[PDB]
């Protein structure tokens, strides 16, 4: 994955 | 994985 | 894995 980020 | 960020 | 930065 590229960048899947968690906020 | 690149840039996977968690917060 | 490149920069998967956790916070």
Request: hydrophobic share 15%.
């Amino acid at each position: 994955n590229v960048g899947s980020n968690t906020y």
